[PDB]
């Protein structure tokens, strides 16, 4: 439904307004039951995650509990590890920039709460290098915490020993990928690996590893504190909890606000954030989960609600839940065209289908914006699109195909007219 | 992506970490597991850039030696990521975000403003080498859509004029109040908090027993 209470919200420091440093955090009481929780043991913590129903919170929303659980298997003499991706690259995502900058601590105890759940020896946080200032904030926060003894040996009074580190990203969206974050951490080129050697099995430095969206790590301590039920109650069925929503582009007050997941879309922009610029009638389309997810046209928006189950019914992905809105004042053919330009300037090129395919769609898309290309080419891009969708080594090729598929699926008449417009003036 | 040796950009340019920098390099290596120094390539290479913006081929070679990694590896990392200059770069090095979110909120205007403000075209740098204009991609901070990254700072939610003001500040004086030069605080609802209006909660609240 929606309408989460501020009291039941998780990052009270969102929008700042409270010292992102420890003191403000102590008034927040973020480090309240940390020793106790870890004392409970890895299993109990992971269990709470399952009860929570917390899905990914990052890109694909895999059940968090089960995922983390995959490394709750006995150590084989290799130190297990925690990797917390804070790349936050998906266009439209400033979701994570908040927790890191505004509430660094929540993530610090998220790390150790999560750490004992997987029995990780240590956690490395890969904040995108672009955010240099952001990094300045977290290690100040990490430094505070150890000074306190909250982390490190004798973590918060626990025999558990966990060390948290921050790693510099270098302006790559793909670094974000789970197998590629690792390789950047490993120091090689940021190129994803194949899934058959799964991340838990082969870890960073060949030591079991797990990767979580920073939001996913951050909520785990509060969910254990509030209990899985409290959390699981807010969401709809499988889709559960309240996910932060970042609305950017063609909305009166673009902002990131956390609301009950499964909140109706027409409402999200209506209640928080602000009205669609030019009236709700001025809504050509919206991309619910960021650039990777397909945009949905207005007909669906009034009805569709932001939860992953509802969106997959709608053929779109909740993803990072970044709402980008396009008024009737925008050349979508060019809007999506720059996202394909966003992906040609960024895919690693390791795999044949993404390398040439994304460049191929970029060339066709640029011609489509001009209208130089004939109408028959439009359904070809479709066929080029699905060749890329199922054949890619990672998901980015998955992601490049979806916006192209959305433009053809709902805005096929407009592209034909741009086709027609150029043919007429000759 | 080919380094054709040039008198300026080639190893004749000797590179070596200042004593202090080497100390920093050591810590960086400590974070990673022992026996995995190679993992510190990115961090160390960055430090080199901090030392010299150009990050010449010589620098890349030094990084390799310092981390005992094959020279090619350093090259791969440098030529793969984008935050590494691999050429001389402007003192200010402004970067304008032009992904759809920003563009939808009129990013193009900002770029145009800069082009003539700077007098230099994108992909190029000012004669004094004070400013280098680059059309970079999503830099995060999308909510404050109109946004650009001057050097390390993130100037956000900027209207065309604001930048001119900022650029002037950069041109005469320094530290031009880096951040969103708008009424909004960070990424709050511009008009008024849609939530988080009430005071934050307290320790232990609604906590399940133990």
């Amino acid at each position: 439904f929606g309408s989460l209470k501020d009291e039941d919200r998780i990052f009270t420091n969102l929008y700042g307004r409270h010292d992102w440093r420890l003191k403000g955090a102590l008034r927040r009481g973020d480090w309240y039951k940390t020793k106790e929780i870890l004392l409970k043991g890895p299993d109990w913590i992971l269990g709470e995650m399952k009860t929570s129903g917390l899905r990914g919170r990052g890109g694909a929303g895999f059940p968090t509990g089960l995922k983390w659980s995959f490394m709750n298997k006995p150590s084989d003499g290799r130190p297990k590890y925690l990797v917390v991706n804070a790349d936050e690259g998906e266009p439209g995502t400033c979701k994570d920039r908040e927790i890191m900058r505004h509430d660094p601590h929540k993530l610090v105890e998220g790390c150790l709460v999560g750490g004992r759940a997987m029995g990780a020896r240590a956690a490395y946080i890969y904040i995108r290098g672009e955010f240099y200032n952001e990094a300045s904030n977290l290690q100040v926060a990490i430094r505070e915490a150890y000074e306190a003894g909250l982390i490190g040996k004798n973590a918060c009074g626990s025999d558990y020993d966990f060390d948290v580190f921050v790693v510099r990203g270098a302006g790559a969206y793909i670094c974000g990928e789970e197998t590629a974050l690792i390789e950047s951490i490993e120091g090689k080129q940021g190129k994803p690996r194949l899934k058959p050697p799964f991340p838990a099995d082969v870890g960073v430095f060949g030591c079991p590893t797990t990767v979580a969206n920073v939001e996913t790590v951050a909520v785990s301590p509060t969910i254990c504190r509030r209990g899985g039920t409290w959390f699981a109650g807010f969401g709809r069925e499988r889709n559960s909890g309240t996910k932060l929503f970042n609305i950017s582009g063609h909305v009166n007050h673009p902002c990131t606000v956390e609301e009950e997941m499964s909140v109706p879309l027409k409402e999200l922009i209506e209640k928080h954030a602000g009205g669609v610029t030019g009236g709700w009638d001025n809504l050509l389309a919206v991309i619910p989960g960021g650039s990777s997810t397909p945009l949905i046209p207005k007909s669906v928006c009034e009805t569709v609600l932001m939860d992953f189950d509802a969106l997959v019914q709608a053929q779109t992905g909740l993803g990072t839940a970044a709402v980008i809105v396009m008024d009737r004042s925008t050349d979508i053919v060019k809007a999506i065209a720059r996202l394909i330009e966003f992906y040609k300037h960024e895919s690693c090129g390791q795999c044949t289908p993404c390398r040439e395919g994304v460049d191929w769609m970029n060339k066709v898309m640029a011609r489509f914006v001009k209208g130089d290309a004939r109408p028959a080419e439009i359904d070809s891009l479709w066929e080029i699109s699905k060749q890329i969708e199922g054949h890619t080594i990672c998901a980015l090729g998955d992601g490049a195909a979806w916006p192209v598929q959305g433009l053809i699926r709902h805005f096929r008449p407009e592209l034909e007219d741009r086709m027609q417009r150029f043919a007429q003036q000759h | 992506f080919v380094h054709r040796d040039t008198p300026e950009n080639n190893p004749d340019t000797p590179f070596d970490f200042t004593p202090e920098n080497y100390k920093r390099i050591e810590a960086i290596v400590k974070n990673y597991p022992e026996g995995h120094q190679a993992a510190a390539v990115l961090p160390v290479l960055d430090l080199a850039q901090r030392q010299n913006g150009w990050l010449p081929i010589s620098a890349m070679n030094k990084v390799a030696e310092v981390l005992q990694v094959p020279p090619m590896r350093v090259y791969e990392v440098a030529t793969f990521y984008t935050m590494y200059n691999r050429k001389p770069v402007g003192k200010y090095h402004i970067q304008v975000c032009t992904t759809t979110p920003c563009m939808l909120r009129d990013s193009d205007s900002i770029l145009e403003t800069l082009q003539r403000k700077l007098g230099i075209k994108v992909g190029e740098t000012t004669p004094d080498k004070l400013f280098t204009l680059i059309e970079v991609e999503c830099l995060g901070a999308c909510v404050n859509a109109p946004m650009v990254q001057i050097n390390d700072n993130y100037y956000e939610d900027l209207t065309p004029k604001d930048i001119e003001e900022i650029i002037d500040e950069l041109k005469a004086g320094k530290v031009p109040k880096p951040g969103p030069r708008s009424g909004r605080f960070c990424c709050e609802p511009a008009g008024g908090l849609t939530s988080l209006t009430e005071p934050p909660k307290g320790p232990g609240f609604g906590v399940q027993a133990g």
Binding site: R168 | K23, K30
Partner: peptide
């Protein structure tokens, strides 16, 4: 306001806290 070495130098300061290596 932060310096170019804030991240690295701060980290070095944290080195002492950093738990022993693997």
């Amino acid at each position: 306001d932060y310096n170019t070495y804030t991240f690295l130098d701060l980290n070095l300061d944290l080195s002492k806290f950093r738990l022993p290596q693997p």
